[PDB]
């Protein structure tokens, strides 16, 4: 198939592993900023 598709083109497994490793991990303190501060 083509690169550009109407549907979401299923990706290679290594590609999906990489995208599953790469995410935005939100930096939060150990304490929630509402109850304590």
């Amino acid at each position: 198939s083509k690169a550009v598709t109407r549907h979401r083109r299923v990706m290679h497994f290594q590609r999906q592993k990489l995208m599953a490793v790469t995410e935005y991990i939100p930096p939060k303190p150990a304490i929630h900023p509402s109850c304590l501060p």
Binding site: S1, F13, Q16, K17, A20, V21
Partner: protein
């Protein structure tokens, strides 16, 4: 019920594979040792011009050894001993 069109792993529709923390740990390990490799590849010891002409003698002499091994090739030597040892098949006690 629950079948897949065509082959299970190819085409416009295939079986959806999913990732596991097992594989995630595996690949993070591989890429972190690869970052170690990057670090150790950095900070070279010598410069291009410093390491330019040090191994020329070794490369040359190795190649002439290869050349000599190639040139020195002939049929083996033939011997009367090897020829006549075949007569000892008709050995027998007197």
């Amino acid at each position: 019920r629950g079948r897949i069109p065509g082959r299970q792993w190819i085409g416009k529709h295939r079986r959806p594979r999913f990732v596991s923390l097992r594989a995630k740990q595996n690949m993070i390990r591989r890429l972190e040792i690869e970052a170690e490799n990057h670090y150790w590849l950095s900070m070279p010891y010598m410069t291009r011009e410093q390491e330019r002409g040090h191994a020329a003698v070794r490369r040359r002499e190795a190649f002439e050894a290869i050349k000599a091994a190639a040139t020195s090739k002939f049929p083996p030597h033939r011997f009367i001993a090897d020829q006549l040892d075949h007569l000892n098949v008709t050995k027998k006690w007197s």
